[PDB]
Design a protein around this ligand. Structure first.
Ligand SMILES: O[C@@H]1[C@@H]2OC[C@H]1OC[C@@H]2O
Ligand SMILES: O[C@@H]1[C@@H]2OC[C@H]1OC[C@@H]2O
Ligand SMILES: [Cl-]
Ligand SMILES: [Cl-]
Ligand SMILES: [Cl-]
Ligand SMILES: [Cl-]
Ligand code: NA
Ligand code: NA
Ligand code: NA
Ligand code: NA
Lengths: 659, 659
C-alpha cells in the first residue's frame, strides 16, 4: 500500500483497488474507503449495446497506482469491466491524490478520462468516502442546502411523529439522491460539504471552475441498489456525501480540496470556507458597504414588509391591488400605530404594464404624485422603500408578450418555455432596466431598490448579462436587495430576500436547519425571510413562534408579506417582531455569527454567539428543557444576553379566548 | 351527428372524431369535448421501432359511430396513425356511450381493445372532457385526495406568498399529473371525481371492478406538451380530470358512470356517491356499531393520545421508551390534572420483541402486572386503551428477521424490499396475530384495539389475506381502529387514525382542503388526525389553531402524539382541545356532515352543518372577515351553534410573554 504522510495526516492507498483511507493523526480517527464494495469510484457509461451501466472502477482490467512526487500519488483505472464480463476497452480514468506538505489538506482530482467508443457520464470519485457509521459515529453530514442543514448519523429522541418520518426515511429513497450547486431550488449555496463525528471533521471544497453534483446517503444501507433485483441489501447503514463529476459536460478542473479538522464540526467547516470565500472575492463586508452608503444603517432593526398587490402576476387585480392612498395609510399605520421604528417597505404593484416593462407609475392606482406622497411619508420615517421590479419575465398574459427577447438554443428552439419568470435573455436585461429605473429614482427620490429573480441562482448560461445588470444597479449606490441571492452576487447587494429554506425539500424529514451560509457570510450580506414562506404564514418551516426564534438564532431579519386585505391580522405579529426580534437583529446586524450549538438531544434548544457581544439561546420545541448549569429554556422560549448586559427572557404562548 | 337524448340530457356525438358534448337541458350548460386537439381519447402505445408514443385516437384511419340501441352509441377507433404518418395496423379501441333512459346519467365504457403486433399502455378516455375554462367558469375540480380537496378554476385573493406559489403552479408541471385509487400516499380514497361551475356539476364514478388512474390539469394551458419542442402552447388555460385506463394491466370493466347535477357542487357530488357507497356495502353506521358494542360511546368527545416510546422502530430505546409506571402516571395526569373526561390511550412500546411478534409484555418496562395496573387505571376512568400492534412489518434490525414470510413476484423476486413496514404477506398475518392477541385481551381485559399498517390501503394483491385478518380482529367485538383506513375497511373498524392530509403532496399549493370523505362517511367511521402530523406539531397543514378549527369543521377528533419527554409541553393544547373541540366532537360524532361551505373569497372562512343540529363556522386565516348579515368571524376564530341553541364564539391568540 502506497503512503502519503505529513505531521497531521496519513493517506493509506491500496495498490490493487486505488481506494484510500485517511488517518487524522491528532485525534487518531481513520476515515475508511468505501465500506460497501471497496470501490475507488463509480462510473456510469454505455456498454456495447448502448445501455447505461454503473461500474466499480476498482474492477478495471488494469490499475496503476504509483507514487509520482514527494506528496503526489497518481492513479490510473484502465478498461473497466461490465456486469456481464465484457470490457470497456479504451476507457480509462486518471486521478491524483496530492497531500499538502505542511497542512492537513488533501487535493483529489480527476485529471484525465478517455471514452474510446463509449460515452461516459457520471463519475463518483472518491466513492462513498469519509463515511460515518450509523449509530456508532455520533456526528452528522453537513450540507449547505440553501441556508444549510446537518444530518445526524444516529437515531435520537424527538417528537414521535417526527421520529417515525425520520427513521423511515433512512430506510427508503428519501435518504439518497443528489443536489446541484448554486440554484434557488433544492440545491447548495456553497461549494463544500462534509462529515464529522465526536473526534474529527472533514470537508471538501469544490474547485471554482467545476460544477459537480453532490450525492447524499443519509443512514441508508444501500437497499436502493437492490430493489430492482428484489433482494435484501447486505451493506451497513452509513452516511456519506460524494462528488458527482459530470464527465459528459464538465469543462473545468475536476478537483476537490479536503480539509481535516481535529475536533471540528459544521462551525469549523464554515470558518474554513470563509477563508476561501474571501480569496474568491465574494466577501464584501456590510461595514464597507456602510462606508460607501450611510443609508445601509436603515436596515438594522428593520422589518421587511412586502405589500403584495397581485403584481407582477396581474395588473390591478380586483381584491388584491392596493391604491397609492391605501399604501400610504398602511405605511402610516405601521409607524404611528404599531410604533415600528425601522422598516423596508416593498410595494408589489406600482406600474400599469407587466414586467419586464416596469413603467409607468400606474394612473389607475392614483398616479405618480400619490405614489410620491407614499414614498415621501416613508422617507420622513427613515424607512427604506422600493417598488417591485423584474427584468427577466416574459408573461403569457402580458398584451406585450413576444418571443423576441427570449433565448433560443442551437436548434433554434425557445429556452425557458417552462419558467415564465426567467425568459428574457440576460444580455437584454440591463437595457430593460435602463428604460425607466433612473426616471423612477429621480422622480421618487429613491434611496433603495429591490430587483427580483435575476440573481436567485448562479448558472453559467447568461452569467455575463447578469453581471452587467448587477454592475448597473450597483452604480446607483442605493441600499439594494434581490430575491434569494448567491455568494457570487454578494459584492453587488446589501440584502438577500430569502436564503433560508424551501418548504418541501429533499432531506427535510432527516435534517436540522443550521446557519451554514450565515456562519460564513453574515458580516457580508443581510438576509430576510422568503416572501413565499413569510413569518406570518404557518408552513412546514413553522409558525411565527418558531420562525421568530430561528430568525434570532440564525441572524436574519423579519419578513411580513401580505395581501392588503390581511393587514389587520398582521398587527400582533408585527408587534411581537418589533418587541423581540428587531432589537436583536439591530444589535447583531453587522457582526460575525461566531458559533452555533445544539444544546438538547432533540436539537431543538440552540445557542448562537455574535461578535457584537450578543448570545441567543432559544428552544424551538413545545416543552421546557434544561441546559448546562440547570438553566431552563421554556418551550418556544428564549434567553438572550445583550451587549448592554441586559438578559431578555420569555416565551410565546397560544391562548384560547372563549367569549 | 349522432344524438342520444332523454328528458334531462342531450349527447351530441361527432361521427368524424367520436368526440361528444353533453347539454344539461335545464341550465343550457354544454360540457365540451377536448378543447385543445378535439381528441376523443389519448392512447399510449409502442410503434414499429418499439418506442412509446401517445396518439389522438380521433386521427385513426377508420372511425365507426352508430346507434346500436335506443340509448347506446357504439364507437370503434380503427388503425391509429402516428405522428410520422405510419399506421398502427391492427390496433382498435371499441367504446360505448349509454344514456340512462330517465336520469341525467351517462355510462362510458371501453369495451374492447386489440393491439396486433403493438403493445398498448395508457388510454385517457374520454380525453380532456367536462373541462372548466380558467377565469371564466368560477367553480372547481373536486378530487377525493385522502380527506379531499377542491381546485378552483380561477384566480382569487389570498395571502401574497400563497398567491405567488398558487399562480406559478398553474403555469408549470405542478398542475398536471396523475393519482391512483386507494393508497395511503398521494392518491384518492373514493372512486370518483368531478368538475362544477356556477351552473352545473358533473362527477364520474369508476366501476367497482376497475382501477384507472386519474389525470389532472389544474388551470394549465398545456405548456408541458410543448416544452420539449421549445414552442409556446397555443391552447387555453382549462381544468380537467381524465380517467387513465391501464390497458396493459386492467382486467375489470372499464366503465365510468357520469352523473350530471344542476346547480351542484362538491357537497352534492359526495351525496351522490354516498348512495353508491351504501350499495357497495362499505357503509356500516356508527349507530349499528354502537348497538353491537356499547363501548363505542367512549369515543365521542375523546382525545386520541399516542404515547410514542420509540417502538415499533426500536425496542426499549433510551430517551424514548416509557416504563409502565411512567405510562400509568401520564394517564393519571391527563385525567386528574387536565380533567380529560374521555380518551383513547394508545401506548407505542409494550413488548420486548419487534413486530410482527407482538409479545411478550416487556419485563424491562415493568412486566405484565405493571402494564395491567396502567390499563386498569385507564378503564377506571372510562378511557379506551390499546397497545401498538402490527403484523405486516419485517425489520432489518429485528434479530428474528427472515425473508421466509415475505412475498415474491412472478419472477421470483422479493416484493416490498423498499417498504419495511409492509413486507409480511397478508396470507400470513392472521396467524401472526393469533399468536398472542387473545392472550393480551384476556390478561389485560382489553376493551379496544388498534392495528397499524395493514389496512391503510386497498390494493388487489394480498386483499384476501387482509380481509381474513380484518374479520378475525372484528370477531373480538372490541372498539377498534386502524391506521389511515380505506372505505373498503369501514365495516370492520370503529375509527381511522388519519384520513386527513399528507404534509407534502401533489396539488397542495393549488387546492383547498374539503371534507369530501367525511361528507360521505362521517356517520359510518370516526376519524382522528394522523400520528405523523398530530395536532401538537406545526407543519404544512397548520399549527394547533388551524388544526383544531379544521377538526370541528370536518368532524374529526383531536390527535395528541408525543414522545414521553414532551408531555409537559402538551398540557396547554390538551386543555384547549378539551375546552373547544371535545364538546363539539361529542355532539356531532354520530351525525351526518350535511353540508360544507366556503364563505369568504380566500376560502379561509367556512361553515359546516351536522345532522345533530350543530353548526360550525370557523376562520382559518389571520384576519377577521365578515359573512352574511354582517357577522364578523375573528382571525383563527369560530362561531358555533350547538344543538340546544346556545352560541359559542371565540378565537385563538398568540402572545409574547417577556419577563
Ligand atoms: O412509521 C410508521 C408508523 O410506525 C410504523 C410505521 O407504520 C405505523 C406508523 O404509521
Ligand atoms: O412568483 C415569484 C414571485 O413574484 C414573481 C416570481 O418571482 C419573484 C417572486 O418570487
Ligand atoms: Cl435571469
Ligand atoms: Cl432562517
Ligand atoms: Cl399489509
Ligand atoms: Cl382534517
Ligand atoms: Na431520493
Ligand atoms: Na447597495
Ligand atoms: Na406534476
Ligand atoms: Na369494533
Amino acid at each position: 500500500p502506497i503512503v502519503l504522510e505529513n505531521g497531521k495526516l496519513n493517506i493509506n492507498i491500496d495498490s490493487k483497488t486505488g481506494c484510500f483511507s485517511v488517518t487524522e493523526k491528532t485525534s487518531g480517527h481513520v476515515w475508511k474507503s468505501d465500506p460497501w464494495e471497496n470501490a475507488a469510484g463509480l462510473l456510469t457509461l454505455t456498454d456495447s449495446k448502448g445501455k447505461k451501466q454503473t461500474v466499480n472502477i476498482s474492477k478495471s482490467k488494469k490499475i496503476e497506482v504509483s507514487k509520482t512526487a514527494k506528496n503526489t500519488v497518481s492513479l490510473k483505472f484502465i478498461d473497466p469491466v461490465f456486469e456481464d464480463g465484457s470490457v470497456a476497452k479504451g476507457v480509462s480514468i486518471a486521478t491524483e491524490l496530492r497531500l499538502d506538505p505542511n497542512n492537513a489538506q488533501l487535493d483529489v482530482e480527476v485529471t484525465e478520462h478517455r471514452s474510446g467508443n463509449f460515452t461516459l457520464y457520471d463519475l463518483r470519485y472518491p466513492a462513498r468516502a469519509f463515511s460515518l457509521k450509523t449509530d456508532e459515529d455520533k456526528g452528522a453530514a453537513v450540507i449547505p442546502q440553501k441556508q444549510g442543514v446537518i444530518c445526524p448519523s444516529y437515531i435520537f429522541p424527538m417528537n414521535g411523529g417526527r421520529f417515525c418520518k425520520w427513521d423511515d426515511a433512512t430506510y427508503n429513497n428519501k435518504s439518497q439522491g443528489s443536489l446541484e450547486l448554486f440554484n434557488n431550488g433544492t440545491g447548495l449555496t456553497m461549494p463544500w460539504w462534509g462529515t464529522y463525528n465526536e473526534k474529527s471533521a472533514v470537508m471538501g471544497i469544490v474547485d471554482v471552475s467545476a460544477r459537480p453534483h453532490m450525492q447524499y446517503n443519509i443512514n441508508n444501507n444501500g437497499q436502493y441498489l437492490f430493489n430492482a433485483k428484489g433482494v435484501m441489501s447486505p451493506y451497513q447503514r452509513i452516511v456519506f456525501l460524494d462528488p458527482i463529476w459530470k464527465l459528459d459536460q464538465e469543462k473545468g478542473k475536476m478537483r476537490i480540496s479536503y480539509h481535516f479538522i481535529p475536533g471540528g464540526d459544521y462551525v469549523d467547516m464554515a470558518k474554513v470556507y470563509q477563508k476561501e470565500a474571501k480569496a474568491r472575492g465574494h466577501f464584501v463586508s456590510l461595514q464597507e458597504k456602510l462606508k460607501r452608503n450611510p443609508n445601509v444603517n436603515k436596515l438594522p432593526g428593520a422589518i421587511y414588509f412586502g405589500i403584495y398587490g397581485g403584481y407582477p402576476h396581474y395588473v390591478n387585480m380586483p381584491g388584491m391591488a392596493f391604491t397609492f392612498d391605501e399604501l400610504k395609510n398602511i405605511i402610516k399605520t405601521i409607524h404611528d400605530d404599531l410604533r415600528v421604528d425601522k422598516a423596508f417597505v416593498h410595494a408589489w404593484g406600482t406600474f400599469s404594464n407587466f414586467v419586464p416593462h416596469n413603467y409607468p407609475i400606474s394612473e389607475a392606482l392614483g398616479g405618480p404624485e400619490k405614489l410620491k406622497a407614499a414614498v415621501d411619508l416613508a422617507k420622513s420615517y427613515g424607512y427604506l422603500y422600493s417598488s417591485y421590479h423584474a427584468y427577466s419575465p416574459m408573461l403569457e398574459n402580458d398584451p406585450n408578450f413576444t418571443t423576441d427577447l427570449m433565448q433560443r438554443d442551437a436548434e433554434g428552439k425557445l429556452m425557458n418555455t417552462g419558467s415564465r419568470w426567467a425568459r428574457v435573455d440576460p444580455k437584454f436585461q440591463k437595457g430593460l432596466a435602463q428604460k425607466n429605473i433612473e426616471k423612477e429614482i429621480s422622480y421618487l427620490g429613491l434611496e433603495a431598490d429591490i430587483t427580483d429573480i435575476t440573481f436567485a441562482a448562479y448558472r453559467e448560461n447568461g452569467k455575463e448579462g447578469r453581471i452587467e445588470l448587477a454592475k448597473y444597479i450597483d452604480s446607483f449606490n442605493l441600499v439594494n436587495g434581490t430575491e434569494h441571492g448567491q455568494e457570487q452576487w454578494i459584492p453587488y447587494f446589501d440584502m438577500f430576500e430569502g436564503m433560508t429554506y424551501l418548504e418541501d425539500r429533499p432531506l427535510s424529514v432527516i435534517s436540522h436547519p443550521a446557519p451554514l451560509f450565515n456562519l460564513v457570510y453574515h458580516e457580508a450580506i443581510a438576509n430576510f425571510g422568503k416572501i413565499q414562506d413569510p413569518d406570518n404564514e404557518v408552513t412546514a418551516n413553522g409558525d411565527f413562534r418558531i420562525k421568530a426564534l430561528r430568525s434570532m438564532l440564525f441572524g436574519r431579519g423579519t419578513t411580513i408579506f401580505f395581501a392588503p386585505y390581511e393587514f389587520e391580522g398582521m398587527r400582533p405579529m408585527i408587534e411581537m417582531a418589533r418587541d423581540l426580534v428587531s432589537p436583536v437583529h439591530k444589535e447583531t446586524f453587522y457582526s460575525e455569527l461566531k458559533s452555533h450549538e445544539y444544546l438538547s438531544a432533540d436539537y431543538k434548544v440552540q445557542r448562537s454567539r455574535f461578535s457584537s457581544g450578543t448570545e441567543v439561546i432559544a428552544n424551538l420545541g413545545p416543552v421546557a428543557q434544561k441546559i448546562e448549569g440547570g438553566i431552563s429554556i421554556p418551550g418556544y422560549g428564549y434567553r438572550i444576553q445583550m451587549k448592554d448586559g441586559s438578559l431578555k427572557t420569555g416565551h410565546f404562548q397560544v391562548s384560547l379566548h372563549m367569549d
